[PDB]
């Protein structure tokens, strides 16, 4: 089912409610900061009457002065709060920003005209509660809302005015760890001598670092270790014998709180078992809290006194602070050096007063504040993640508001006006902006770096910066790569090729007739240089783009006709003309089949396929059409052989019986089906009697008997070679097309399609075998078997199949088998737990980033994740900016494609011994699975009811 289906429920009108509709939504809503203190009954009530709003950037929900009609909670995005001190909304200024989890609008409780104009700052998702529903929830649950709502509706301060440093989970965490140490490395805690004085039962920093690195795979560096221990030290569960505020990887003594009492009792066998079961989850917990605890520690160093390392640690965390999201990478790297960290102990502290001089911009790291405006009162309340006082960075105007802390122990980041402006200027000092008609036409940063422009202008910069020195030959290929790769986005060949023809013949704009003699020569050599790097990118794909080939043809002429010649440059061009003259000259697609043991070969759109298209009566006609055939072309080929009347539709149908009518303009539909998906052609008349085939149902009997006689390392090995074949069949540009929309470029992504499909194919392979293994003793053997298969995959640096398997073993159908997991040897409970941790999405799948980075090609990446990166970057950044191609976006997406190149820049071939029989190869490459979840789930409930 859809990850986010709760939204579909918020759609369903209130009166048409369903218990599950509420169960689902509630499961989602419970995770909002403005619902935390909410009694379950309240949250349900909200679920029953709560509307959903998906607003676009720049929408105003209401203006200062209007009558308010709803109360809101932000699920995603952010909004600006603007207030005017006059009767003109043009004078309104932004005082603060509200992000996820924050709520506003409660002034409707007593019918007070809106204090402020609120505007979405970006695409936002809100929960909307109509006045009458809210007045009702408030009278009923007022006591549960006093902490959330601004006065007079709730209390002002929720701080000390009607507890120590340790918290519950961290006090716990410190206990687990001390128990593991005492158990695993007793020597680590003991009396230690240093200059006559002896420090009782304590540890050494470097040593705790050493140990944490040994005990778990989620820790990749001593620096990361430091952050993780600093979690316990700031919280005071692990203390430096001399009370330093920060943990250090040094020869310094620290003591566990438990060892603070002379007679600290040894661990009980129960505690050790209890610890042994929690160590992994404790470590994962600390890995997630560790980055920001480290940022805070380093940040306590004055801006001027921060080292390169300090700044990196700070920089890395900023990337995960919403408030800083819209800032550039450069400004963020600049901020690391000026950001001040500021904390306050007591609620009620006045951070600043309305009317005072505007000094700083604040971002709330911990706690909350009240926004106060004289005359109006508390206008809104802000929480962690929100920011305020940004007016101070615009002009020299006075505070339009007062900020008082709403609770004790608030943390903020603070940027002072002075530093903020230096950064803004220094950013122009490293900028270079060529203006044409009195506006930017090209922008760049000192190495230089293109940022934006038009296709024509961006093209000349790349031609113009080319270096024809054979020494910079590689360095030149480098700079041109982003352009040759991404150009299809903002400048297709239909516009590029002609533009290159022009540049080649164009007459030099400066110089003597003789000087120009030379100029035109270089320009020509440069244009040829770019064409070559251009042909290199497309490579084999050239023979799909009729234009591109036509161009080269006429372009090879121009290069020849020259009386004098570019000796050491031309030869390469004819090579391409001949190869496009040769391999293009053939009457073989080659005809491809799909319904032994082939070594995968790249599939091309122009390649013809023999494909089965089924009919209502489950008969089928085999048509022979190009891979890139359109739906219309397919219908025509079918309607012809069958003589089928007017009105045939083509329909995708998955094992689930689900049916999608395909559009006539759709291309390459063969590779975009589900694992067991089939393709049908029938009359729209009898669209309803269309039913899946018996074969799509999936296998009925397991296959455990077969591959249990196969070693985990042989299956893995054979899975990896196969994976490599699929992986290497993917042209780097297929990634580009996919990210931007295959339908656009009218080219295929068949190879990428098959490879991504392969991922899903593997994970359903796991869920299938498990669910088709009725015996309880023989499933436990599979978990061991799949876990070992994964292990060998990761060992082979095939992260692709590794994650596929792990995601299979995480499938609800497999996860719910409580009885089956519990009887698994603790050894494999450990491996698997470590496996899930690499799939942690926190900080943008950092766990995975670090794991892969610490490896050397050949390597198969976690490809679906890698696809999301591109999709993400695409949607979170505009291609065009004021009618100018956003080239930094281009580069960011090229970043990913290039990472693929690197991953497959070394051949794959481990120890000679795989030799291995073709039997395991056959199995691995001929998987037959159940891809119907509803099915797999039902089975799961027929092996272990509940």
């Amino acid at each position: 089912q859809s990850s986010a289906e709760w939204i579909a429920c918020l759609d369903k009108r209130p009166l048409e409610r369903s218990s599950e509709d509420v169960d689902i939504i509630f499961t989602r809503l419970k995770g909002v900061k403005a619902f935390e203190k909410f009694h379950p009954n309240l949250l349900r009530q909200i679920c029953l009457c709560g509307y959903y709003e998906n607003l676009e950037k720049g929408i105003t929900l209401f203006r200062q002065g209007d009558i308010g009609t709803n109360w809101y909670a932000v699920l995603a995005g952010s909004l600006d709060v603007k207030v005017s001190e006059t009767s003109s909304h043009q004078d309104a200024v932004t005082i603060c920003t509200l992000g996820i989890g924050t709520a506003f609008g409660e002034s409707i409780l007593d019918n007070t005209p809106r204090h402020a104009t609120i505007v979405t700052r970006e695409s936002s998702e809100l929960l909307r509660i109509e006045q009458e529903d809210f007045k009702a929830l408030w009278e009923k649950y007022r006591q549960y809302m006093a902490g959330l709502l601004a006065p007079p509706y709730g209390v002002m301060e929720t701080g000390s005015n009607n507890e120590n440093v340790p918290s519950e989970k961290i006090l716990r965490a410190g206990k687990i760890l001390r128990i593991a140490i005492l158990s695993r490395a007793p020597h680590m805690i003991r009396d230690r001598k240093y200059h006559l004085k002896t420090y009782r039962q304590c540890c050494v920093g470097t040593e705790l670092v050493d140990w944490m690195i040994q005990q778990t795979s989620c820790v990749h560096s001593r620096t990361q270790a430091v952050g993780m221990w600093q979690v316990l030290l700031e919280d005071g569960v692990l203390n430096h014998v001399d009370q330093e505020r920060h943990f250090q990887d040094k020869y310094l003594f620290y003591r566990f709180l438990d060892d603070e009492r002379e007679d600290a009792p040894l661990p009980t066998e129960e505690e050790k078992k209890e610890c042994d079961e929690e160590l992994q989850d404790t470590m994962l917990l600390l890995s997630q809290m560790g980055p920001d605890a480290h940022m805070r520690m380093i940040l306590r160093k004055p801006p001027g006194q921060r080292t390169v390392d300090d700044l990196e640690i700070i920089y890395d965390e900023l990337l995960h602070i919403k408030a800083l999201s819209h800032l550039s990478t450069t400004v963020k790297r600049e901020l690391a050096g000026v950001l001040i960290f500021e904390s306050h102990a007591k609620g009620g502290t006045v951070l600043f007063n309305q009317g005072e001089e505007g000094t700083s911009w604040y971002i709330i790291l911990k706690g909350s504040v009240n926004v106060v405006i004289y005359g109006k009162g508390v206008v809104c309340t802000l929480h962690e993640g929100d920011d305020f006082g940004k007016l101070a960075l615009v002009n020299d105007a006075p505070r339009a508001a007062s900020i008082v802390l709403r609770e004790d122990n608030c943390h903020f980041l603070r940027v002072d006006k002075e530093d903020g402006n230096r950064i803004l200027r220094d950013v122009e000092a490293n900028t270079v902006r060529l203006k044409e008609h009195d506006q930017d036409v090209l922008v760049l940063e000192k190495v230089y770096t293109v940022m934006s422009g038009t296709p024509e202008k961006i093209l000349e910069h790349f031609l113009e910066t080319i270096r024809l020195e054979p020494s910079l030959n590689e360095a030149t290929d480098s700079v041109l790569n982003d352009f040759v790769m991404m150009h299809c986005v903002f400048m297709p060949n239909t516009q590029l090729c002609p533009a290159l023809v022009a540049h080649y013949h164009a007459q030099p704009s400066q110089g003597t007739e003789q000087e120009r003699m030379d100029y035109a020569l270089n320009n020509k050599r440069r244009v040829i240089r770019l064409v070559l790097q251009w042909a290199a990118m497309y490579g084999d794909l050239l023979q799909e783009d009729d234009v591109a080939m036509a161009f080269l043809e006429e372009f090879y002429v121009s290069v020849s006709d020259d009386a004098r010649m570019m000796a050491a440059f031309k030869e390469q061009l004819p090579e391409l003309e001949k190869i496009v003259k040769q391999i293009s000259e053939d009457a073989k697609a080659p005809q491809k089949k799909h319904k032994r043991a082939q070594k995968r070969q790249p599939i091309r759109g122009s390649d013809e396929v023999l494909f089965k298209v089924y009919c209502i009566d489950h008969t089928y006609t085999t048509i022979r059409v190009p891979v890139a055939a359109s739906v219309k072309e397919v219908i025509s080929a079918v309607a012809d052989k069958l003589g089928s009347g007017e009105g045939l539709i083509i329909v995708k149908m998955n094992s689930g019986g689900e049916k999608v009518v395909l559009k006539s303009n759709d291309v390459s539909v063969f590779t975009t089906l589900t694992i067991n998906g089939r393709l049908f052609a029938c009359p729209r008349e009898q669209f309803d009697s269309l039913t899946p085939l018996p074969e799509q149902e999936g296998p009925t009997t397991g296959t455990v008997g077969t591959f249990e006689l196969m070693s985990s390392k042989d299956l893995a090995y054979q899975m990896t070679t196969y994976d490599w074949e699929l992986f290497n069949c993917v042209h780097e540009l297929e990634l580009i097309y996919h990210t931007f929309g295959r339908h656009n470029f009218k080219k295929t992504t068949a190879n990428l399609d098959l490879f991504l499909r392969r991922f899903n194919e593997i994970q359903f392979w796991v869920v299938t075998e498990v669910c088709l293994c009725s015996q309880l003793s023989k499933r436990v053997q599979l978990l061991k078997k799949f876990i070992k298969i994964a292990a060998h995959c990761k060992e082979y640096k095939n992260l692709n199949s590794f994650f596929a398997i792990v995601m299979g073993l995480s499938n609800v159908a497999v996860s719910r088998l409580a009885l089956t997991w519990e009887k698994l040897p603790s050894k494999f409970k450990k491996f698997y737990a470590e496996f899930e941790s690499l799939m942690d999405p926190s900080r943008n799948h950092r766990a995975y980033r670090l794991t892969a980075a610490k490896l050397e090609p050949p390597l198969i990446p976690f490809m679906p994740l890698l696809i999301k990166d591109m999709t993400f970057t695409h949607e979170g950044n505009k291609t065009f900016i004021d009618n100018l191609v956003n080239f930094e976006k281009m580069r960011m997406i090229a970043n990913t494609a290039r990472t693929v190149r690197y991953y497959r820049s070394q051949p794959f071939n481990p120890d000679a011994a795989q030799k291995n029989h073709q039997d395991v190869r056959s199995y691995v490459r001929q998987l037959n699975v159940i891809d119907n979840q509803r099915t797999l789930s039902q089975m799961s409930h027929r092996l272990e009811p509940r």
Side-chain angles (χ1 to χ4, degrees), residues 36 99 311 911:
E36 58 184 346
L311 299 176
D911 184 354

Side-chain angles (χ1 to χ4, degrees), residues 924-936:
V924 176
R925 285 174 160 80
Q926 301 178 357
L927 296 178
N928 189 337
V929 312
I930 304 180
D931 66 334
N932 189 346
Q933 184 65 36
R934 182 64 181 180
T935 298
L936 297 167

Side-chain angles (χ1 to χ4, degrees), residues 421-449:
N421 294 154
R422 297 187 177 276
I423 296 178
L424 294 173
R425 294 186 295 268
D426 299 347
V427 174
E428 294 302 319
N430 299 341
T431 299
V432 179
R433 303 177 180 268
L434 299 179
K435 300 180 173 61
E436 179 174 335
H437 298 280
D438 189 349
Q439 68 290 144
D440 286 333
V441 64
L442 187 61
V443 186
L444 53 170
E445 177 185 344
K446 300 176 180 176
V447 176
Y448 305 105
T449 63

Side-chain angles (χ1 to χ4, degrees), residues 554-595:
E554 303 301 343
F555 180 79
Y556 178 57
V557 182
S558 302
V559 178
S560 299
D561 296 342
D562 296 341
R564 180 184 177 183
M565 298 298 304
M566 300 74 55
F569 301 101
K570 183 181 188 61
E571 62 298 336
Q572 303 183 351
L573 180 54
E575 180 182 350
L576 303 173
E577 298 295 340
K578 297 298 181 178
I579 184 62
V580 180
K581 180 67 176 182
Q582 178 184 344
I583 60 179
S584 179
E585 180 63 345
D586 187 348
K588 183 176 184 178
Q591 59 180 344
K592 299 180 179 300
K593 65 302 299 178
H594 182 98
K595 62 181 62 178

Side-chain angles (χ1 to χ4, degrees), residues 67 125 147 194 254 256 307 331 393 395 442 454 470 490 508 535 545 637 700 725 750 765 768 794-795 875 891 916 943:
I67 298 181
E125 306 177 37
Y194 183 74
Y254 299 93
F256 283 93
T307 68
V331 56
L393 302 182
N395 61 357
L442 187 61
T454 62
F490 59 98
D545 187 347
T700 57
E725 303 189 357
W765 172 61
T768 291
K794 176 179 156 61
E795 181 65 8
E875 300 176 341
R891 171 163 51 266
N916 185 350
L943 289 61

Side-chain angles (χ1 to χ4, degrees), residues 774-927:
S774 296
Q775 297 182 345
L776 182 168
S777 63
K778 303 305 174 182
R779 294 197 303 268
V780 175
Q781 301 303 339
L782 287 180
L783 288 56
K784 294 176 58 184
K785 189 64 175 184
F786 289 128
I787 293 178
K788 298 182 298 182
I789 297 178
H792 284 103
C793 282
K794 176 179 156 61
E795 181 65 8
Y796 281 114
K797 298 184 299 175
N798 183 342
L799 298 301
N800 186 57
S801 297
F802 172 81
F803 289 92
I805 296 178
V806 174
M807 292 190 61
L809 297 173
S810 298
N811 184 332
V812 184
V814 179
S815 179
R816 57 168 280 97
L817 300 184
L819 298 298
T820 305
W821 290 103
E822 63 183 355
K823 300 199 64 176
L824 181 61
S826 298
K827 182 183 181 181
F828 297 95
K829 288 191 174 64
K830 300 182 181 303
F831 298 119
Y832 181 77
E834 291 183 332
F835 291 178
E836 291 182 330
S837 57
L838 285 55
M839 297 198 57
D840 181 6
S842 60
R843 296 184 174 82
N844 184 23
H845 293 93
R846 177 178 288 183
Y848 168 75
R849 308 291 173 178
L850 300 175
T851 293
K854 187 175 182 182
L855 299 176
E856 58 296 330
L859 171 172
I860 306 181
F862 182 11
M863 199 63 164
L865 174 54
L866 180 160
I867 291 302
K868 285 196 174 183
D869 298 358
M870 297 188 296
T871 294
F872 175 97
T873 299
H874 179 29
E875 300 176 341
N877 295 313
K878 295 185 62 180
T879 300
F880 299 104
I881 298 180
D882 190 355
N883 191 359
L884 297 181
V885 181
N886 184 358
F887 192 84
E888 185 193 351
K889 178 191 179 183
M890 299 304 86
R891 171 163 51 266
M892 297 184 307
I893 291 184
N895 170 357
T896 301
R898 183 165 307 103
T899 296
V900 173
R901 180 185 303 159
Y902 174 68
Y903 289 154
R904 59 184 189 181
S905 59
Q906 302 299 334
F908 172 74
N909 191 349
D911 184 354
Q914 301 185 347
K915 302 181 182 60
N916 185 350
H917 298 284
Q918 187 280 341
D919 60 336
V920 296
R921 188 177 192 271
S922 298
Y923 180 79
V924 176
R925 285 174 160 80
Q926 301 178 357
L927 296 178

Side-chain angles (χ1 to χ4, degrees), residues 58-315:
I59 298 182
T60 64
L61 290 59
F62 56 67
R63 293 183 178 89
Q64 179 179 344
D66 297 353
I67 298 181
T69 60
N70 302 269
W71 175 77
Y72 299 84
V74 39
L75 304 171
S78 60
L79 301 79
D80 288 337
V81 177
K82 305 174 189 297
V83 181
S84 181
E85 190 171 352
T86 64
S87 56
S88 179
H89 294 110
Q90 65 175 350
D91 297 342
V93 300
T94 302
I95 66 178
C96 61
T97 301
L98 296 55
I100 182 181
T102 300
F104 59 89
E106 60 285 12
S107 58
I108 59 180
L109 286 167
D110 66 347
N111 300 2
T112 298
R114 297 294 194 193
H115 303 116
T117 297
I118 299 185
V119 184
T120 58
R121 188 176 185 275
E122 55 174 324
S123 307
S124 298
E125 306 177 37
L126 301 175
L127 181 59
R128 195 188 86 260
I129 297 182
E130 294 181 337
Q131 185 169 182
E132 193 66 350
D133 294 342
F134 186 69
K135 294 188 174 182
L137 299 179
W138 184 57
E139 296 187 344
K140 183 61 180 299
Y141 301 94
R142 180 174 296 109
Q143 297 189 350
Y144 300 86
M145 303 183 188
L148 173 63
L149 300 179
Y153 320 108
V155 301
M156 185 167 197
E157 173 184 337
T158 62
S160 182
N161 292 135
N162 185 358
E163 297 299 346
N164 190 358
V165 299
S167 67
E168 193 65 352
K169 63 178 180 182
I170 297 177
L171 186 65
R172 177 63 177 179
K175 182 185 184 62
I176 291 65
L177 297 178
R178 191 179 79 100
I179 293 177
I181 299 180
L182 293 171
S183 302
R184 304 186 176 194
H187 61 276
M188 291 182 55
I189 303 175
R190 61 167 173 83
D191 300 343
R192 304 182 179 271
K193 300 194 187 68
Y194 183 74
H195 296 285
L196 300 179
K197 294 189 175 184
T198 72
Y199 302 69
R200 179 188 49 87
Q201 301 294 311
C202 58
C203 302
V204 179
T206 55
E207 198 171 12
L208 293 316
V209 175
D210 291 333
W211 181 82
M212 178 176 284
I213 297 177
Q214 293 289 326
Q215 300 302 328
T216 182
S217 56
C218 69
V219 182
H220 301 96
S221 69
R222 303 188 67 78
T223 295
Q224 183 190 343
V226 172
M228 296 171 57
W229 290 111
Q230 176 60 13
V231 175
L232 287 54
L233 186 159
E234 68 171 348
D235 177 301
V237 62
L238 173 56
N239 304 310
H240 177 41
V241 296
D242 296 333
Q243 303 302 341
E244 292 182 347
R245 302 180 303 273
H246 56 300
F247 181 88
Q248 290 183 300
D249 191 359
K250 295 184 177 180
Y251 187 80
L252 297 177
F253 308 139
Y254 299 93
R255 183 173 300 109
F256 283 93
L257 192 57
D258 291 346
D259 296 328
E260 199 71 11
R261 284 291 185 175
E262 179 65 343
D263 300 341
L266 302 178
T268 67
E269 294 295 345
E270 179 185 345
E271 293 179 322
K272 301 177 182 180
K273 179 185 183 63
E274 185 174 343
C275 167
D276 191 350
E277 298 178 343
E278 297 181 350
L279 187 62
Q280 184 63 351
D281 293 338
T282 306
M283 289 301 185
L284 185 174
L285 177 57
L286 295 175
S287 67
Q288 296 169 335
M289 294 183 278
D292 58 300
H294 206 152
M295 178 190 67
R296 296 193 292 277
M297 181 189 74
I298 294 177
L299 214 49
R300 302 182 191 275
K301 296 183 182 178
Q305 292 298 330
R306 297 172 185 170
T307 68
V308 295
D309 295 339
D310 297 336
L311 299 176
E312 179 185 339
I313 299 178
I314 298 174
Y315 172 64

